[PDB]
Amino acid sequence: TACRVCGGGVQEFLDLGRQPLSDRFRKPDELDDEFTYRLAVGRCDSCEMVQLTEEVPRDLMFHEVYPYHSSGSSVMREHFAMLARDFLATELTGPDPFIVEIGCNDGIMLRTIQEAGVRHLGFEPSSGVAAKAREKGIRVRTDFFEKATADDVRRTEGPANVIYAANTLCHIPYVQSVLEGVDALLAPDGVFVFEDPYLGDIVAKTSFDQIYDEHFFLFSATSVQGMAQRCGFELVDVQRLPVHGGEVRYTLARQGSRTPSAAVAQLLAAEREQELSDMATLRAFAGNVVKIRDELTALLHRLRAEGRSVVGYGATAKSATVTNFCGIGPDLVHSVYDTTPDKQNRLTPGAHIPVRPASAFSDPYPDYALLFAWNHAEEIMAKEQEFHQAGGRWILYVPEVHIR
Ligand SMILES: Cc1cn([C@H]2C[C@H](O)[C@@H](COP(=O)(O)OP(=O)(O)O[C@@H]3C[C@H](N)[C@@H](O)[C@@H](C)O3)O2)c(=O)[nH]c1=O
Ligand SMILES: Nc1ncnc2c1ncn2[C@@H]1O[C@H](CSCC[C@H](N)C(=O)O)[C@@H](O)[C@H]1O
Ligand SMILES: [Zn+2]
């Protein structure tokens, strides 16, 4: 398997087996046939980039009915509005600024930019969520960002002061093409800023559900630094973020144009000291993944034997990994509750557990809810205080299997 960043050899360290598309929710009457692929994760020998060993073709994952709506979380809405105001105050000052967002989804970030009157363009190849962004008055192209479409925007719109990507750069195995795109499109003094699930958090929390078809890369400061350097850029800042289970926001600039913050060296040294990306570390993680599987299925089967009812909360893409790697179906978790209309009245991928609206999670409550949207715990449990007050309990599997 050749590394997508540098062409080095990739060594597997975790095999999560056959998996379905994580974001395909079937109607109950649909033929039980899904696309499957082998989900496994390796580390490049040369650049230390951790990445999947099989690419799902982009058109199978991202298209007209892609179901994830970013704006469905109040924490994430505030998180991106804050980010946008931060760019408006720093990188987008001065005359006729231009920001391009890769993966704008329903416009969660760009709405703030558009309300500031700033020129912008979102790339969103998933046309149904693109339309939700356009309804907010955001300018969006229903295209993948890559070298050619970047060139096209550079031709018609001129250079961008900021190119931003949240939870999208790690989805893209053709990252070199994206980088060439960024090189064509970014202002000489601009920044390419992206934030994605962080390898250090996944390792520390054993959050293996962060690994599924759409998550190609599990970035670290170490791998991102190498990737930037190889493509003509430089990692010039890093910021840790609590969202989505733990992320890092990386800022890249053209090489030598800005001086790296002390934060970059500090995080690099912490990764090296902790041996984050050493194969033995990544294998110990893989062994902990198996332990969490075994304890989670033991618990779920015991709850069944003791006549306790169990549901899931949040029809996350992440959960496809949990239910298929663990073999959890509707006989152990009867329904999954979710606020996304396009996921409701459908079945989860591979495991086929029915998804019902969150409004249906109500008195009489089940005994236990398996929290798939664990990265949204605070937001979710704040809205579901009555469940817990009535004696309903949460089952979490990050960072360990526990009930509370
Ligand atoms: C906050 C909240 C979420 N939900 C539902 C909405 C979503 O269907 C789900 C939460 O999904 P998530 O944890 O935001 O994201 P996913 O794991 O599904 O992954 C998606 C798809 C991307 N590839 C991934 O990187 C991230 C950005 O979003 O949980 C609720 O039902 N109640 C809630 O109160
Ligand atoms: N090459 C590419 N260019 C632009 N967007 C892409 C892409 N490949 C996937 N996407 C979009 O990337 C998104 C990832 S989901 C992340 C959405 C949002 N930025 C958030 O952080 O919540 C999807 O909307 C998907 O359609
Ligand atoms: Zn490599």
Residue whose C-alpha is closest to residue 6's, from 174, 229, 219, 227: 227
Give the residue, by CA position, lying nearest to ligand 1 atom 1.
73
Q: Name the pairing type of β-strands 346-347 and 354-357.
A: antiparallel
Query: What CA–CA distances, in Å, run from 401 to 269, 295, 319?
Result: 31, 7, 15
Inter-residue contact 348 to 50 (CB < 8 Å): no
Inter-residue contact 243 to 210 (CB < 8 Å): no
Per the annotation, does 47 bind a ligand? yes
Inter-residue contact 139 to 121 (CB < 8 Å): yes
Q: Which atom of ligand 1 is nearest to the CA of 339?
A: 31
Q: What is the rounded distance in angstroms from the CA atom of residue 112 to the CA atom of residue 101?
A: 12
Residue whose C-alpha is closest to residue 24's, from 374, 347, 358: 347
Q: Which atom of ligand 1 is nearest to the CA of 374?
A: 13
Inter-residue contact 37 to 24 (CB < 8 Å): no
Residue 187 burial (C-beta neighbours within 10 Å; 0-12, 13-18, 19+): middle
Amino acid at 59: D
Residue 205 burial (C-beta neighbours within 10 Å; 0-12, 13-18, 19+): middle
Inter-residue contact 218 to 286 (CB < 8 Å): no
Query: What CA–CA distances, in Å, run from 50 to 54, 130, 379?
Result: 13, 30, 30
Inter-residue contact 158 to 184 (CB < 8 Å): no
CA of 278 from ligand 3 middle (Å) equals 14
The two domains 53-254 and 306-404 share their CATH topology (first three levels equal)? yes
Inter-residue contact 339 to 355 (CB < 8 Å): no
Helices 318-326 and 279-305, interaxial angle, to 10°? 70
Strand partners, 122: 101, 140
Strand partners, 235: 252
Inter-residue contact 101 to 87 (CB < 8 Å): no
3-state secondary structure of 13: strand
Report how this structure was experimentally obtained: X-ray
Q: What is the rounded distance in angstroms from the CA atom of residue 274 to the CA atom of residue 284?
A: 13
Per the annotation, does 231 bind a ligand? no
Q: What is the rounded distance in angstroms from the CA atom of residue 309 to the CA atom of residue 332?
A: 8
CA of 5 from ligand 1 middle (Å) equals 28
Per the annotation, does 164 bind a ligand? no
Measured from the CB, is residue 55 less than 6 Å from ligand 1?
Answer: no
Q: What is the 3-state secondary structure (H, E, C) of 247-312?
A: EEEEEEEECCCCCCCHHHHHHHHHHHHCCCCCHHHHHHHHHHHHHHHHHHHHHHHHHHHCCCCEEE
Helices 147-157 and 175-185, interaxial angle, to 10°? 10
Q: What is the rounded distance in angstroms from the CA atom of residue 244 to the CA atom of residue 195?
A: 10
DSSP 36: E
Give me the residue spans of the domains in the chain. 1-52, 53-254, 255-305, 306-404
Q: How far does CA 260 lie from the centroid of its chain?
A: 26
Inter-residue contact 11 to 329 (CB < 8 Å): no
Residue whose C-alpha is closest to residue 372's, from 326, 323, 319, 302: 319
Per the annotation, does 212 bind a ligand? yes
Measured from the CB, is residue 129 less than 6 Å from ligand 2?
Answer: yes
Structure tokens at 43: 């580390």
Per the annotation, does 90 bind a ligand? no
The residue to which tokens 């934060």 are assigned = 263
Q: What is the 3-state secondary structure (H, E, C) of 95-141?
A: CCCEEEEECCCCCCCHHHHHHCCCEEEEECCCHHHHHHHHHCCCCEE
Any idea what the Cα angle at residue 228 is, between residues 227 and 232, rounded to 5°? Answer: 120
Please, what CATH class does the domain formed by 306-404 belong to? alpha beta
Q: How far does CA 209 lie from the centroid of its chain?
A: 10
Measured from the CB, is residue 125 less than 6 Å from ligand 2?
Answer: yes
Under CATH, domain 53-254 is a member of which superfamily? Answer: Vaccinia Virus protein VP39 (3.40.50.150)
Q: For residue 379, give the ligand nearest its CA.
A: 1
CA of 145 from ligand 3 middle (Å) equals 22
Q: What is the rounded distance in angstroms from the CA atom of residue 381 to the CA atom of residue 10?
A: 40
- Which residues, other chains included, contact 306 with Cβ-Cβ below 8 Å and sequence gap of 6+? none
Handedness of CA 89, 91, 94, 100 (dihedral sign): negative
Structure tokens at 147: 């070298």
Strand partners, 338: 357
CA of 207 from ligand 1 middle (Å) equals 15
* Residue 229 neighbours by CB distance under 10 Å: 14
**Mutate which of 316, 335, 342 for ligand 1 pocket (most atoms within 8 A of beta carbon):** 316
CA of 317 from ligand 3 middle (Å) equals 27
- Which residues, other chains included, contact 75 with Cβ-Cβ below 8 Å and sequence gap of 6+? 243, 376, 378, 379
The residue to which tokens 């900021």 are assigned = 162
**Mutate which of 65, 145, 171 for ligand 2 pocket (most atoms within 8 A of beta carbon):** 171
Structure tokens at 148: 């050619």
The residue to which tokens 């696309």 are assigned = 35
Per the annotation, does 326 bind a ligand? no
- Which residues, other chains included, contact 279 with Cβ-Cβ below 8 Å and sequence gap of 6+? 11, 13, 43
* CATH classification code of 1-52: 6.20.50.110
The residue to which tokens 């709506």 are assigned = 69
- Which residues, other chains included, contact 57 with Cβ-Cβ below 8 Å and sequence gap of 6+? none
Please, what CATH class does the domain formed by 255-305 belong to? special
Structure tokens at 200: 């250090």
